[PDB]
């Protein structure tokens, strides 16, 4: 509450309705400084902007990271606002000819190639433009997903890439795991990546210049006090690099969620409180079309309650105490739920709900214009 | 395929990439003509624009329907571009003071009030503005949802409404059913609405002027030949009106899905075909952030395949036949799935997938700018 309370107090004092994203840019800077300085000299941090690509966020982040990871022409353009093309890396399973030509034209650092067909399409553009391109091969190690090259197929794609004079094969890209909260398990996964990369390098005798170790550094939305043990991970990661003799290989991570989640808040006023067939609901300004994370992940999103002491109406507020309460937005769908049957100690109409850990995949994944509501306002604290 | 094929052919001949919403406005007009002309004189159709509020769609629809049902200030503003305020009806569980003041200022036809607190906030605005407003009370008949007034609380809100001189209580709004494909069940639900409205009207001694019977007329995405039997519904609905003596009560429906679903298509080219740990995937241009319906509803969306014979590259296409295949978009999440493990007769890179029945809750529910991809192009067919 400490960070958002002065903002909420000022909005209330100015008779300004509360439906806002609030971002702590000071906390973001401190978090980034800590993460990036802890890394060994051969390892780089790229920000995966899919988590949050708001211009002010990218402006702030750009100083502290090696570059941006992007997955479309639009993200390339957003990244180029603050980084040279040579510090943008481009992944994704469906890169169009238009996107590939744009990437090559601008001079993107690496393309993370996901198939033989993509390699051939990229190569045709390079031959046409008379340019060269550094790539990684994205590997899907042995569940079935659409991403990367199936482990069994990687040898053939390596061989193809090596004989294409316009392609420079730097190494491999692994992004297998999502939202891992276990730092020791993460070290064991990186070890697997190292061994697979070295085995392919040794089999095909090409220099292992670079490995992209992906993201998947998790955030805990169920228990906010039990986050990824980054310092533990980094110490053991450093040891692993020495044990596996990877000091002369450049490494990068591509993190989104872990960089921006905890510095964002979605704050919204209570419009109505009602009981329907025994179940209590609180209806909030905005909705899950502005903050879809709880619906997408099917969880009760963490929040606190700002208890507002004044009353703008001549009739009493609606208040409840110590009820299972379902928090919903303004939308006309029963799917518009931030939290279902959660304990609320006290809540009244006019109070403000402060949703925490809203900085990553909050606004970015949301169906902003469903039902044509005005967008929330954005406040960036410096 | 007859409707979209000439559009796809033109795009291919012009070397334009295929990632489009295509709408058959002629089909839409014929559908609306049929629906609106079939209804009895005391019943009107309103279009619930949340299903699809594209301006060209609204313009076309406005020629046939009585009006628009809206649920936000943005939808009011869109509605007003194509209808006067006195043919716009405004519902939703969280109407802000700003929205209520806007609606009152413009003179919307009805506000469908969903709680005692909303009634009090609306009344405070009306007293401040020296204006009056016709309302319905939205009722949640005895599952818990956030919508409307719980049945056992309706008596108290009626009495509060009748005592407020700035409020004109016209009657009731019921919208409790969702995607119903059974026409006879739908008649039985309307029967229940009629009896409840009459009981409250008689108990509280005010004239029942109007009932909003809601939407929830379904569309079948699993079996496209088995749609809602509208003519059967209307015939029995007309009989029910006479049977229940509702001829002097005005009625409306507020349908979205049923009006626009079948006349929209989401069309996209195949960018890649790959096998990963035994499973085949076709990667399409665009994604479920442009057409989220298959993901939201967790189904395999109906589609057809248009084959393109030409090869624009100097290297070979990827071609497969008779494989169970998962169709995905360009996004970086394993959730970006249009259809899972569906048998495909034959498909190559460069071919086009035509997703049918994409007109309702297609673009309107989608997270358009996630990963910052260019929007699809929109084509509206008038011939």
Written account of the structure:
- The structure is a homodimer.
- In chain A, helix 5 links the parallel strand 4 (88-90) and strand 5.
- In chain A, the strands form 2 sheets. In chain A, strands 1, 11, 12, 13, 14, 15, 16 and 17 form an 8-stranded mixed beta sheet that branches. In chain A, strands 2-3-4-5-6-8-9-10 form an 8-stranded parallel barrel, surrounded by 4 helices.
- The longest helix of chain A is centred in the middle third of the chain and has 22 residues, at 183-204.
- The first copy, chain A, has 382 residues and is an alpha/beta fold.
- Chain A has 11 helices and 17 strands.
- At the A-B interface, helix 4, helix 6, strand 7, strand 11 and strand 12 of A face helix 4, helix 6, strand 7, strand 11 and strand 12 of B.
Strand content of chain A: 25-35%
Oligomeric form of this entry? homodimer
How far from one another are the termini of chain A? 17 Å
Shape of chain A: elongated
Tell me the number of strands of chain A.
17
Biggest sheet of chain A, in brief?
8 strands, mixed
Structural class of chain A: alpha/beta
Radius of gyration of chain A: 24 Å
Instruction: Output the helix-strand order of chain A.
Output: HEHEHEHEHEHEEHEHEHEHEEHEEEEE
Q: Which percent range fits the helix content of chain A?
A: 25-40%
How many helical elements of chain A? 11
